[PDB]
Every structure is written in structure tokens, then in C-alpha cells.
Write a protein that binds this ligand. Structure first.
Ligand code: TZD
Ligand code: TZD
Ligand code: TZD
Ligand code: CA
Ligand code: CA
Ligand code: CA
Ligand code: CA
Ligand code: CA
Ligand code: CA
Ligand code: NA
Lengths: 525, 525, 525
């Protein structure tokens, strides 16, 4: 067998059947004779390729496979890899290298010092020392991406390797099963359960690894037994809990002092599946107030090590959430009362308040919709106004890098063909990965893109007002016609300048048979 | 003085007056109180920011200054940095970091292990250990980018540093002059000149560092004295010689055997300002034929070290080209005869042959036009058909990474406001950095963009036919309306489906007062 | 509080009370006012410092703390770090940096690009962005070294940081408890137990992480229940099983074909706490024979990913070994029969055969002796001839790097003051870290060093005969007087030229009150 045949056999035996890619010449010997049982999803720029694959991996809860062109293609994808690193996304990034005979002379398209290029944003990065090693290196890539804490990996392959003979012993790779589905030992788990059972006023904080593990329902059971309020850890990349459940208390503010104040009076705070904590604004104060202790369950040693407070347990979130939910006592305390509905903001017949947009989406969207957020100044309102009952209902760029939601919404829609995906993206953010629209058109992936057009980088302008920073350049983005961009890439486009038109556009988009972009005129901040 | 005030003083004292950027919150404390004597050029995605800055630096022959947002912004620019590394472009890339007080906890927007992120595509990469060190680190960045061999550098700055007090001794940085304008010592230069004077059939090969040095006219004098044919080294990022001069012999094929055959019978081959050589296709054979010896003058130790043949001299290209041109004897050999004009290809009233497009551009464009090439299957025809008399008339992505020409053409047009820039870009390549169009519209930078629309990644399809590689996916890019994309970003757009319409569109574009995009329907390969 | 006071408080609160070091000026502000409750162990060269700390950490089963001088001191220790990486040794390596005000100018003793220096041989490597961050960075170092898979970490600290004010919120670091004591979830553990219970002819292979976990007794119970033979995985850094237990089958040969042949006929092979596998010689063949399947339990994702065959479970070895031992059925198969005693090799009145040396050590040493091996050509005989009943009885350089055993034997003796340590070291290997002897003399650490003097690098000469490699230079090491080296560093020294003198020397060494070196004249290979 060839390296090509053996590698595709390994991929299919490990559950991989789709290649997300933007091709180049170093990749042609890999992509030739493409297997009939695989799909290739083309995107027009590599940030788009990786974003699509990332949404697909996060929604599918399985690794996604990517093929990029040498250094330039890898490099164009590194902002997308920064988000994937923070979301623990299991991405297998492969890039073609020059033929081994011209690497030394640094022929055009040689990826020099290849494994160092995507560092520090990958868990493992490698170029094999020989063609026969390629299937084994691919096996390592698959398992490194997939083991907890999941994350992106990188493999560079010289193009001449694919046609070489494989090692006949590579068959031992095909059916390897590697598990990291582990939980704290019985004695120490009993100690933790007793601490939870004994708490007078526990609180629960959940992060994105809960939703990645599909541990959401177990965390609902845990919160109901402990009769505990539940937040979402700050800068949230996913939604780990039903947002109208009576225990739910919303998205935590991303500040040190704000969080310790929020937790004041809670004697034990159990954090599951989050860094402690992804603060953002600088809001100095106490990490925790006197009387509060914190216990973190994380799948990532790096998170456990860097927490500035609390105890930690490094284990699989699915296994731990299930064990805790099934072991804790039912507290005799009263179940927390649900948060009240958000108020309706006054809305005239002109430009839309973001609050109006979210209320209308909540009214019209199916109950199993999936939302993506890259409307950076409206996140708080989004979290208050969308009832997200189900797992896998929310994604936000985990490293804060714009350019994620537009392509990721296409990958999520590919992963979840029966759940309507609605990406809510600011006019600024929409540009970073605008060409991803073409993939939705070409493959007829029926994502709805809602562009919140307020003419400016609103979150930045707000923070500049917050610093009394005058004379900051580059904050306005006038003069972009998003319906024309959509037409450019073959996506149906609608405009909503007021509420009547927003409702009409959403009705038209929800009944369409393909992707739709709606440009919404929103109120300037 | 503050670190902010001292750093902008250093920049202006070192000749920097423009910031190319896409802003974020870690950068607001740098950009606030932006000096009135500086310009900020916004682009909508970081590959675009860096591409614009790169074209500006290459055309201006001076460093360009860039400001990007943390890891995600840096990462989005790394494909652009791969081209800048290969073109020796002097780019000072700065990125904002989190405040020093929250780097440890890895708050959102922390750039983890920052200096390793752009490696291996930068000459120097650094984050200062304290705020007071920032001006000195900026000084290092300026000089590292600017010294031969020029190239991109990276500086990460925690946002809280800018408001801190500067070291009063930083004033010694402001007027430092650092020179690498050096040439081979007299004794060894005399030996080289004698070898050139004695050659029976010399040949000259020129690379991009000639055009970067503005050594073009000196190389014309050198070739006229030696009565020697002149090529352009393969995979050429720039044009180092007038393409209708009688000595000119065109772009070398990017293959080992092809080049040694081309050079057969030449006893001494002098290469100036190029790697030896940027081969591309694998075309194995002799590096040089018996009877040919090679001497390379390069500004880059890495090029001298990796050449598989020949002697080398590591020195400044401007200084060496001037010295050689003025020292060699006038040979009594006959001056080479000019290459004949290219033939006219038969053209019907339908879709355009690329040859027709280049002939028409050559007929209509001003004699001091500047061309950019990202039409990957038509490069040979472009080089045969455009008379480029002047320095700084041609740019092509030096690492082969698409996404360079569209933004770089805007930066070149900014650098050369009196020379009409015409970017010739394939329909595939146009997407990588499509949002750069907005910058041309906003700042009214009058670049002309000629999109060669043949519906496919033609160079890739050709190479797949060359390998008899069947069943390669992802090679076609149907369904893109480039006039709508242009309208989306505010650029006037025209379509040319035949020759009459091409001539009309070019006449309209050449007389326009702003940027123009022309979508040309070209013949499918 | 100062950074100095806060950091020592964190160290003591996390169980650290000893600093292994070789001091320099960047370290004086850390070491000044050294706390009265800490000990400082000086060694004369940094390979020695780290080797001592490594033996201490491995024998104590807890992290050891090291302080080295800048780049040169760190660099002198990197061969020792290569061994520590392979043995999963929890080492906290700190190095002093220049004052932040002179890092930029690269003053003498600046550690440039410090965090990259020990890569790729550390789990985490860091220099803090400010003085107040130092305690938090130290906390990260402590936990990263200590979490599974344990390993060395690196922290660089500018010398001016220690006297600065600490952040008052650093107190939250002091009592953090971080656990990785995890095991496979119940459902999948039940599946594994059923597979073991059902096996017709199981085999067990144990690696060093068993001994690190003190899982040895649980593995004895497991092997007795399964009635299974037990090997030791190849290139063994530790001894994980009593070597005279009836199930024990010895050290596996470090070859692919040899191991698959050894395992032939075993239907299920359970590997615990080892890479799969640390082969050495190139012995190509089948990884496993038909009929054998392999299941690996490892604490290290990198081991699980790179195994070329088998299933894997990534979990804590202590927790998994205990769970398996207590869950499997008692098989009705007959318990394996003990291996026969080794034969006595014929020995005349001249130079000693290594077999004689090991038999005599086994006869004379206490039953709770601890052995170290750096006598590279005699490893097989050592494993056959020493009865090691207890955990923590054997250490061998895990990456194959000589220079480990001499210093590590001092650290092990410090960790285990009531167990006599006997290091058996070849004459070649003894030189790499010879100055470590001084530490044993100064602190009166009563290690016994047995130098096997055969005049040559015997393992290398053997492998050169194996390749029929003629004319290899550098294989002989004549002319070293080890008694004089011992006297040089203050250690009592004895010589044994024959068996009578070996017995007399060992009797004298075993009754001595301090360290003793015995130079043994062994037979040339
Ligand atoms: C790749 C990248 N570049 C730059 C930024 C900086 N940035 C930018 C430019 C934001 C503005 C987003 O504007 P928007 O139109 O999408 O939304 P709002 O108007 O609601 O802020 S938010 C933010 O963090 C970024 N996060 N990611
Ligand atoms: C960033 C990036 N991604 C992918 C490629 C691979 N690639 C691609 C995709 C080419 C096709 C360009 O298509 P085009 O329409 O611009 O021109 P032609 O049809 O004349 O080839 S040429 C080439 O090397 C690349 N060079 N750079
Ligand atoms: C730091 C280092 N340098 C070089 C070697 C190479 N090497 C050397 C030089 C060996 C010879 C050891 O000689 P010895 O006297 O200690 O033992 P034998 O005579 O029993 O081989 S074994 C081996 O792998 C090494 N392992 N480690
Ligand atoms: Ca099919
Ligand atoms: Ca906006
Ligand atoms: Ca001005
Ligand atoms: Ca094309
Ligand atoms: Ca004391
Ligand atoms: Ca020896
Ligand atoms: Na990198």
C-alpha cells in the first residue's frame, strides 16, 4: 500500500470523512484520487477553512480535518487557530510541504522550520522524518487533537511522501482506541461530594468544556440537587446551561472585583469546565471575598495551574459532571427562583436597538436554533434575550478574534442540518472572513447571517470613551454594502431598516431553502 | 515624558509617519492622542493591513510600521508575513498585549508566548521586560527591520506600558544612524572585477534585491559594459531590469535542469540580489553544466549559505552593483541583440486570452505604470508582454502566497501617487484579501484592479494535468460576482466580456479619479 | 510583603523546604535572607545540581526545587533535563535573570529569549512580565511540575523582582490543592476488567511510572489475581516490581521484533506506566504477532498518542493500578513459577567479571538497598542478579544520558537516609558528573559509589563490533585514577582488583559513616 492509501484508511477508521481545505500544489499528491467516501469542503481563504472546520468540530463534538497550503496557507489560518486553542477545538491541521529533494535549497513553497510556524497555538506540531512515518504521525495528530484537553495540532507533509510505500506494520494504527474519559478517584470524589452536600450556600459556574462534553443535562441535575444558582464563566465561548432554567443567573462580568462581589456570601463555588477566570477588563480587587472558597474541575492542566485561587481537579468534564450529579444529596433548600424576563426597550419606527433584534429573533426562531455571536458590543443583551434550552446553542470566538462566527456558522450548520443556525455578526467583524459566504452558497448550507450594521467598531469606541481616550483613529467603518457582498458570493440578501422590515426579512429567511444574509440597520452607540 | 510620547518621537525621528493598522482594545492606549503629524491607514482584516504596508515599504524603499491586535490579529497576518520574509520587506509589526497585571492569569486577549507566535517568519521578535524598555525595544525593531538583509520584525507591548514614565536616557535613541551599506574589500573586489573582465561569455542573473536597492540602472551599466545577457532569477518578486533593453532575456524557468541548460556555454554567471535559486517545480538535473561557474552577490547570509553551487559575497546590493558597474572594463564584444516582440495571439470576439489582456494593457497604460501579478497561470505571458522601463514596476507574492497583490497594490499606489498602479489578479487569488478594496475606496487611493476571471484555480489545474492526477477536488471557483464585491466595498466596477469592452473599460479606468475594478472574462485553461 | 517573602511562603506552604543550587549574582537577591527552615544543597556544576535534585524528587515522590545561574547555568544542566523529561521527574528549575533595566542592552548575564532555552525538555517555561507576578508564576511552576504527567518546568526571574512589593492577593496561592488522581470512568473500567478476566493467557508489562506512583504492591496483587507473567518495559528507568516474585520475567529487550516474539501467544498484554515502547536497537519486525492485543494505561498523553499499536487509557497510574487490582477476578490458572537463580560465572583470582560484582553486591547489601545503574554494558546482568524486593530500589538514566547516576545517587540517599544507596557506574560514565562527589563529602551523604573500571566505553565498543564498524575513534578511556578523584573531592576511596579485595572493600564501605568510592578492576569486553 502507498502512504496515501494507508493514511486515508487510517482517517476513515478513526471516523474522519470530511476534508476542509484550500488547495495548493504541495497538496495535490494528497488530494489526487480523493476517496469516494470522503467529502471536500472548499473555502476561499484559510481563516475561513479553519473557522468552518472549527464550527463543525465544536458542534459535532469530534475532530475535524483540515488541509492547507504550506507556510502562506498555514499563516493565513493562525488567527483562526488562536480561537481554536481557547475553545479546545479538536482540529487536525495538515499542510503540504515541498518535495524532500528541494527543501534544502528553500524552493518556492518550502515551509521553513514548519513545526515552529503555528506554535504556540497548537498542542503538537510535527513534520515526519520519512515518508513511511507519515501514517504514524497522522495517528499521533488524531489522538493529540482528541485527548483531553482537546485542541488543534499541526502536521506538515512533503508532497513526495504520499506515493511512497507504506510500512506494512501501519495497520496496527487503524483501530487504536485512546481514552481520556477519567474522573477523580473514589476516596477524593467522596470528599468533594461531602463538601458540596455540606455547603450552606453553594454556587456553580460553568464554562465551555461543559457544552463540549454534552455535560449540560448533568449540570442541570447537579444544580437542581444542590439547589444552587448557576452562572456562566466570563468571555463565554459556548452556552453550558438552559438560559431560562430557574437556577440560571447569566453571564458573569469579566472582571476580578465584579466576580468576587458576585460570589460574596457563597461558601463554596464549584467551577466546571472553565478557566478560572477568563477576565477581560482590568477591574482590580479581591479574587474571592472572605468566606468564599472555590473548587475547579477542568480538563486542562494549564487552566488548573494558572488559577490564582481555589483547589482544582484535572479530569474529563463529562465523566465528572455525571458522577457529581448522581452522587450529591438532594438539598432541602428551596430551588432558586427564575430570573425575570428582560424589559422591552422603547423602539421607534427607525433604526433598530440591538435589544429589539434579539427579542424578535427569540420570538421567531425555532426553539432548537443555534446562535453565533460576533456582535461585540451587544453580548450582554444577547445573553439576556435569547432562550437557549438545548446544548450546542451558542458560539463566540474563544480568543476574542473576529473572523470566527461567519465561517463557524457554516460549519455548525453542516454539523447540525436540522437545527437552524443564526449568526449575529457586527458590520466590523463581518469583514474578517467575508469570503466564507461563498462556501455556504456553493454547498447550499442554509445558515442565516444577521449583520448588525451600526457603522463603527462599537465595543472599541465604548472602551475608548471609558478611558477618555481622545483622538483614537480607525474606529469607524462606513461605506460597506453587505447585500452587495452577499450577492458577490452568491448568497440571497435582504435589508432591514426598521422593525417591520426586520420581521419580514426574518420570515423570508426562515422559510428560504438556502443561506440568507440580512443587513440590519442598528442604532449607533 | 511618557513611553507613548517618547516612542512616537523615536518613530518620527527615524522617518516613520504612517501607521497601517486594524485596532483593538490592547492597542487603544498606543493609538490615543494619535499625533497630528502621523497618518493612520485602516484596513478591515490583518492580512490586508500587512499587505498594504508591505507594498508601501517595497515601493518606498523604507520601513513601514504596522499595529495589530494581540494574537488573533497577529495570527491573521502570518500568511502576509510569509511573503514579506521572502521579499526582504522592512516591516515593523507591533501588537498590543494585555496589561502586565493580567498576563499571568491569561485574561482574554493575552498573547501567550507572544514572541514565538510569528516565528519563523521574522528577523527579530520580542516583548519588553518593562514599560521603560519599550522605546529601546522599538529602536531595536526599527534597526533590525532596516539593516540588510531587510525583513519583518515583531514587537509585543502590554497596553499599560504607554502611560508610564519613559527613561530620560531614551533620547539617545532618537537620531541613531545605522548603516549596512557595505561592499567587498578592494583586494577581493579587484579579483572579482578581473574575473568578469576576463570572461569569454558572461551572463548576469538579477533578483529582487536589485530593485529594492534601486540598483537597476547600475546593473544596466554593468550589462552594457560586459556586453552580457541578463535574466531575472526565477519566482521573481520584483523586476530588476528594463524589459525591452537589448540585453534582457526574461524570467528564468524555476527548474534546476532548465536553468543549467539555459546557462550552458556561459563561463561565468554573476547573480546579483537573488537566492540561488528560487526553484519551484521539481526538474532534477545538474545545478550547472561543465564549463559554467557561478558567483553570487547577496545581501542575505542565509541565501549565501544555502546556494548548492558557486561562490558568494554577502554585501549590500546597491553598493556592490555601483562598484562593479563603475570598475569593469568595456568589453569589445558585440552588445546582445534585443529579443523580438511577442506574437499576437489570435483573438475572437469572445472571452479574452490572457495574452490579449497583457498586450492591451501594454498599449494603453502609461510608460511609468506599476504592475502587480497574482494571476498565477499567466506569469510567463505577463513578463513577455509588458514593457517595464523603470524601477519599481512589478510585484509578485515572494513566498507564493495569494492575498498579497490586492492590498499591496494599494500600498504601492500610496507610495507612488504619480505612477498608475494596475494589479492583475486571478479570480481565485482575488478572494484571499478582498476586503482590502475598502481601504482604496475610503482613502481614495486610485489603484486599478484587473480581475482575470476564468472560473478556476488555473495554475493548480494545470499542475494536476501535469501529474495526471485525477479526481482532485476544490479546483473550481464558480459563482463570484466581482462587480458586486467591488460595490460592496465602495469601488467603481466595470466588466469586460470581450476585447471591445476591455478597451472601453481600461479607458474609463485610466481616466477615473478613484480606484476601479475591472472584471475580465478570460479563457478557461 | 515582598516578592521574596511571599515566594518562600508559597514554597513552604506547598511542601518545598530544600533548594538544590549553584549560585550566581542574578540569584543573590533570591538567596539572601535565606529562610531558617529551608536547606540549601550546593553542587559544583549544574548537571550535578539537577541530577541530585532529580534523584531526590524520584525517591521522595514529590517535587524538587532547583536554582541555577542564568543561561550558562541553565545550559550546563540541559543534559540532566533530558533525563528528567524521560523519567517524568517533577523538577522546578528556577534561574536568575539580569535586572529588568539592563535586559534590553543584553548586559553580561542576561538570559536572552530565556523561556526558549530549555525547550523542548520542559513542560512549561516562563519569565514573568512583572515582579508582582513572580509568586503566581512560581505557583504555576509548582503545579505544572506536579500534575500528571509530572516533569521539569522552568522559571526565569529578573533579580530586581525579589525586593519589590508583592500583590496582597497572592495569599490565595498558598494553600491551593491541585489533583490529577483520576481513573477511567466506571462503565469503561468495567469493560477493561471484563477483558482482563476473560483473557486466556494475559501478560503484564510495567514501566517507571508504576514505581513513581508507588503502585508496585497493587501491581503485585494484580499479577497474582490474573496469574500473569510480569515484565519490565525496555530501557527501564526504575524498577516497578519485586524481582524475585514468581511472576517476574525480567527486563524486556529493547527491540521491536524481540518484544513481539516475547509476547507471542499472550492474548491480552496490559502495559501500565510505560511508553509503548522505549526501543533502542533497530530490530525491525512486527509490533505484535497475530493473536496478541495490547492495552496501555499511561499518565502521559504523548505516550498514548505515539504508541504504534494497542488501545490506551490516559489516567493516574496509582489510581488505575489500585482500581484494577481490587476489581479483577482471581483466575483459577496456576500462578507462574519463579525464574531460576542465575548461574555463577567462573571467576579466577584476577579482574572481576561484572556478574561476580553483582552477585557479591546481592550477597552483602541490605535487603532494602537502593541501586543506581550507569554501567552501560552490564545492565542485563544487573537485572538478573540483584534481588530488589521493595519499591524505589533502582534508577537508570531515563534518556540514556550519562552523568545521572553519580549525582542522583546522592539525592536518593538524601531522600532515603535509612536505605543504603549503591551506585554502580562505569569508568566512562563516572566522569560526566564527577564533581558531584564533593556534595556527598560536604553534607556527609553516605552513598556508596562502585566504579566498574574496564578502561573503555564498553557498550559502544560492543555496538561497533555489532556493525563491523572499523576504525571508530574515541572508544577508550585509559589513565583515570578514581581513588585520586575521590580524594580530590574528599570521599574515602578503596580499590578492588580481585574478589577478595571486592569483598573486603564492600565490608569496609557498608560499615563506613560517610560516602565511599570503590574502584573495581573489571574484565575488558
Ligand atoms: C482579528 C481581530 N482583529 C481586531 C480585533 C479588535 N476588535 C474589533 C475591531 C471589535 C469591533 C467589532 O466591531 P463589530 O462591528 O463587529 O461589533 P460592535 O460594533 O458591536 O463592537 S471588538 C475587538 O476586540 C479583534 N477582536 N479581532
Ligand atoms: C494563501 C494561498 N493559499 C493557497 C495557495 C495555492 N494556490 C492557488 C489556490 C492558486 C490558484 C490561483 O488562482 P487564480 O484564479 O488567482 O489564478 P490562475 O487561474 O491564473 O491560476 S496558485 C497557488 O499557489 C496559495 N498560493 N496561497
Ligand atoms: C551524556 C552522554 N554522552 C555520551 C553518551 C554515549 N554513551 C557512552 C559514552 C557510553 C559508554 C559508557 O561507558 P561506561 O564505562 O560507563 O560503561 P560500559 O563500559 O559498561 O559501557 S554508553 C552511551 O550511550 C551518553 N549515553 N551520554
Ligand atoms: Ca461519494
Ligand atoms: Ca459595528
Ligand atoms: Ca495632520
Ligand atoms: Ca483563475
Ligand atoms: Ca534551620
Ligand atoms: Ca567502561
Ligand atoms: Na510561530
Amino acid at each position: 500500500a502507498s502512504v496515501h492509501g494507508t493514511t486515508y484508511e487510517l482517517l476513515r477508521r478513526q471516523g474522519i470523512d470530511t476534508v476542509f481545505g484550500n488547495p495548493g500544489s504541495n497538496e495535490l499528491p494528497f488530494l489526487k484520487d480523493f476517496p469516494e467516501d470522503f467529502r471536500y469542503i472548499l473555502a476561499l481563504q484559510e481563516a475561513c477553512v479553519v473557522g468552518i472546520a472549527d464550527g463543525y468540530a465544536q458542534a459535532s463534538r469530534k475532530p475535524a480535518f483540515i488541509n492547507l497550503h504550506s507556510a502562506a496557507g498555514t499563516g493565513n489560518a493562525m488567527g483562526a487557530l488562536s480561537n481554536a486553542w481557547n475553545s479546545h477545538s479538536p482540529l487536525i491541521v495538515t499542510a503540504g510541504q515541498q518535495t524532500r529533494a528541494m527543501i534544502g535549497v528553500e524552493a518556492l513553497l518550502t515551509n521553513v522550520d514548519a513545526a515552529n510556524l503555528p506554535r504556540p497555538l497548537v498542542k503538537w506540531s510535527y513534520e515526519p522524518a520519512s515518508a513511511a512515518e507519515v501514517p504514524h504521525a497522522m495517528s499521533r495528530a488524531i489522538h493529540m487533537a482528541s485527548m483531553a484537553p482537546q485542541g488543534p495540532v499541526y502536521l506538515s507533509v512533503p508532497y513526495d511522501d504520499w506515493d511512497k510505500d507504506a510500512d506494512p506494520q501501519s495497520h496496527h494504527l487503524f483501530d487504536r482506541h485512546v481514552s481520556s474519559s477519567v474522573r477523580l478517584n473514589d476516596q477524593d470524589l467522596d470528599i468533594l461530594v461531602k463538601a458540596l452536600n455540606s455547603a450552606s450556600n453553594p454556587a456553580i459556574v460553568l464554562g465551555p468544556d461543559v457544552d463540549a462534553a454534552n455535560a449540560n443535562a448533568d449540570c442541570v441535575m447537579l444544580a437542581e440537587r444542590l439547589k444552587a444558582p448557576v452562572w456562566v464563566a466570563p468571555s463565554a465561548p459556548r452556552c453550558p446551561f438552559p438560559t431560562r432554567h430557574p437556577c440560571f443567573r447569566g453571564l458573569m462580568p469579566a472582571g476580578i472585583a465584579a466576580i468576587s462581589q458576585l460570589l460574596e456570601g457563597h461558601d463554596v463555588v464549584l467551577v466546571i469546565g472553565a478557566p478560572v477566570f477568563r477576565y477581560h477588563q482590568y477591574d482590580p480587587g479581591q479574587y474571592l471575598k472572605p468566606g468564599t472558597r472555590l473548587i475547579s474541575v477542568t480538563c486542562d492542566p494549564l487552566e488548573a495551574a494558572r488559577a490564582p485561587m481555589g483547589d482544582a481537579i484535572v479530569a474529563d468534564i463529562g465523566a465528572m459532571a455525571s458522577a457529581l450529579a448522581n452522587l450529591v444529596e438532594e438539598s432541602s433548600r428551596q430551588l432558586p427562583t427564575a430570573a425575570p424576563e428582560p424589559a422591552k426597550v422603547d423602539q421607534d419606527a427607525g433604526r433598530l436597538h440591538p435589544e429589539t433584534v434579539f427579542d424578535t429573533l427569540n420570538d421567531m426562531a425555532p426553539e432548537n436554533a443555534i446562535y453565533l455571536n460576533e456582535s461585540t458590543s451587544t453580548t450582554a443583551q444577547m445573553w439576556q434575550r435569547l432562550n437557549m434550552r438545548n446544548p450546542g446553542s451558542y458560539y463566540f470566538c474563544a480568543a476574542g478574534g473576529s473572523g470566527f462566527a461567519l465561517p463557524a456558522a457554516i460549519g455548525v450548520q453542516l454539523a447540525e442540518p436540522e437545527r437552524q443556525v443564526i449568526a449575529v455578526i457586527g458590520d466590523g467583524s463581518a469583514n474578517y472572513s467575508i469570503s466564507a459566504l461563498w462556501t455556504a452558497a456553493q454547498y447550499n448550507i442554509p445558515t442565516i447571517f444577521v449583520i448588525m450594521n451600526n457603522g463603527t467598531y462599537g465595543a472599541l469606541r465604548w472602551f475608548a470613551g471609558v478611558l477618555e481616550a481622545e483622538n483614537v483613529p480607525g474606529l469607524d467603518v462606513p461605506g460597506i454594502d453587505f447585500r452587495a457582498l452577499a450577492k458577490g458570493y452568491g448568497v440571497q440578501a435582504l435589508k432591514a431598516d426598521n422593525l417591520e422590515q426586520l420581521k419580514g426579512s426574518l420570515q423570508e429567511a426562515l422559510s428560504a431553502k438556502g443561506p440568507v444574509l440580512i443587513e440590519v440597520s442598528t442604532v449607533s452607540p
